[PDB]
Design a protein around this ligand. Sequence first.
Ligand code: 2PX
Ligand code: GNP
Ligand code: MG
Lengths: 472, 167, 167
Amino acid sequence: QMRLPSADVYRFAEPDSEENIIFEENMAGIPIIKAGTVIKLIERLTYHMYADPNFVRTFLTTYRSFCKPQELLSLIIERFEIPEPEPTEADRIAIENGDQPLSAELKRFRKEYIQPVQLRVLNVCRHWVEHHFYDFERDAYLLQRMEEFIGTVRGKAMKKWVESITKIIQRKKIAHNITFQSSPPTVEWHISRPGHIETFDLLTLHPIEIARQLTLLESDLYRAVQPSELVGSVWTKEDKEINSPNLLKMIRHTTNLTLWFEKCIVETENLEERVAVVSRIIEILQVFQELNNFNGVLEVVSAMNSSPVYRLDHTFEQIPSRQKKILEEAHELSEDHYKKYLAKLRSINPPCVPFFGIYLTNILKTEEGNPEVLKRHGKELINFSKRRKVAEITGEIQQYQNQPYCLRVESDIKRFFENLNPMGNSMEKEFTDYLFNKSLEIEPRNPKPLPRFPKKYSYPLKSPGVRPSNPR
Amino acid sequence: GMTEYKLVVVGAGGVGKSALTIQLIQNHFVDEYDPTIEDSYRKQVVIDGETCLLDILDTAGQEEYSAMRDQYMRTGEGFLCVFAINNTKSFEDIHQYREQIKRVKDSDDVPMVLVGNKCDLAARTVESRQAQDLARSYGIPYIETSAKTRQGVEDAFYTLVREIRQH
Amino acid sequence: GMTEYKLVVVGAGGVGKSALTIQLIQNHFVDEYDPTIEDSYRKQVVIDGETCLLDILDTAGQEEASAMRDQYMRTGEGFLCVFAINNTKSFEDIHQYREQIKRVKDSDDVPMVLVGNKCDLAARTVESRQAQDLARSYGIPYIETSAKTRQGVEDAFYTLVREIRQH
Ligand SMILES: Cc1ccc2[nH]cc(CN3CCC(NC(=O)[C@@H](N)Cc4c[nH]c5ccccc45)CC3)c2c1
Ligand SMILES: Nc1nc2c(ncn2[C@@H]2O[C@H](COP(=O)(O)OP(=O)(O)NP(=O)(O)O)[C@@H](O)[C@H]2O)c(=O)[nH]1
Ligand SMILES: [Mg+2]
């Protein structure tokens, strides 16, 4: 085999035991760790035998539930100072004959234990700095310690990586091109012409461009959500506005857009006009589906499923047959706990904008339905399978966050939607009550007969359709 | 062949809610729970010697998606309205959830159960008497659970199914 | 459960393994030269009408990490062998990578592609023919790419997937 240092000078040499590390039954084929002590977890995070860069992500994403950032740094620095072995018998004999020792064993342990383990400690350091930098912003003593650690690493072996990490740390202290093969489609205009932001509305913007700008907007919002806003279920806790501002900004955009769809519908009192309005919205839903904007799809589906909109039977009697079919397909994505949606998501060709809600529910229940620790033989092991499960979720998310949309921003339409505020100065209950009342006004309950209302739109109600055009 | 019931859990977030449904579905005499897994919200049970299937929709964690609430509620026959006994706001929220359910189902009586949940060892701030009285005025059962210790979890779901049966 | 493919990107230091990978993943050109130790990336993509999950292991070219190589060639299903067309030495090193992979997996038929990167640079010092001749002796396709420019990038990775499929 190969000899390790003493467990009395190097804590990470303790033999594996069911009192310090438990493996998942199934198997690449590297072992999957079910539970372990922090010591054992950090040993495996930087094991000498095999690579597992996925383990590096899982660990750096979820470690704070069981070990503080300063403690982590201390233990990897400890892991990094591996003591060298004493010369062997062969070696001793040559030194007392005035020869140079072969140092075979020492040279092997350096190449097969020390070098891999130190390289993987530096790897944890690189990733921790590149992708989890917030630990350092919130604790500058921690950043000093890291900077010092990197800056005291001598040895030409580690020379290239030490310089690199130093540079990366410096970039992050003081602070993203995109390249497409193809060129984006032409921005499409309807009644509202470019620059005329005063006239922008649901019916006057081109429905194709409404879906696209909302999709750029919603994609950006999705891509900004960091795993720190997710781990610990912190978005549901008292300080959610502090810890999860991007996630909340995005959920909030979704709710505004849904409530805006509702408002547009129930505030169009004339039946024929309201039918045009509902119709256009389903058109926007269609372009959302084309763009794989699943958040956008659900925005529309939620609007249609809402209390004041669902009951408008006279309005939906008059929707074209093709559009009933579209709203039905879309609604069905959510049936059986989002079964068809999940199937569709895991089957499309990105870019896409997932629906973030599924993720929040799974992370939360995962954190809540598995124990922090496993007790074996009186000992307490960190329950790591729980942590790997949360990381698979944050991983899914991060994965859909990479691919950008090949679409042109139109700044004015972008501003228009960023500033959308359907509720005005009203609180959510009183605005929600208003919407439902307006719904009662425009189509009363049976058996009250259906009133008539005057038209409100001066411009044409004909949709220009959802098929892109193309001059040049 | 047997009856399938659609149960929907609603209530303020950030308290104990999720613990309820988890405690029912699982039976942590085997560790590792995974909500990722299909039909980890499906559970076959015998209530009053009549076997049935319980389909539990608990969207815990999506509370901030407040406009998706009508959509989720619409899917269900019976409702667990949950608050936390050590969080008065969540108790005061109960009225609005109920009013909202009445609205999407379009009925003055929808099979529902009020559930007061003990999620931690903090001082209780909603006494069981206030909760009972509120439940009485709504004309619905009141079940108090500590989902942490499995106490009262079955009582809450089974009572709710009884309500659906006696509508 | 969608088919998963474990790709590994190998080759001498500085040839642009990371630049190629991050271009594929993020449509972004990394202009800094930060030596990799071990990075991992996932990408869901539809190739030839089938949806698949790419698992891309990005490896260390620097000689100081040559001991950790065997460790990943075990897992890997297919290999991108990258040299730079303005680095004769990086071309010569390719033979060693190919031979190590063949050795570790113990097969002659291991799915791989020969990638000649940095083809946007005019200062070429490895000739297409020279590399093309090596490719055929290996029984593998030769693709010239630029991580700056996006040329060939998808063609290289997706060609590798096609090879792993037929294997
Ligand atoms: C699928 C879905 C989702 C949200 C929705 N909000 C409003 C509706 C329309 N609506 C029509 C009346 C009633 N459904 C029905 O009467 C259905 N047997 C016919 C129908 C199914 N989908 C439609 C779509 C448009 C028009 C008619 C239908 C209840 C639902 C709607 C439909
Ligand atoms: N012009 C041009 N520069 C490139 C190209 N690919 C990489 N580079 C540049 O060359 C350098 C090396 O890139 P890199 O991807 O880090 O190489 P690597 O093979 O991953 N190195 P290592 O093995 O040490 O991780 C960077 O400065 C990068 O911007 C390319 O196709 N064209
Ligand atoms: Mg690299």
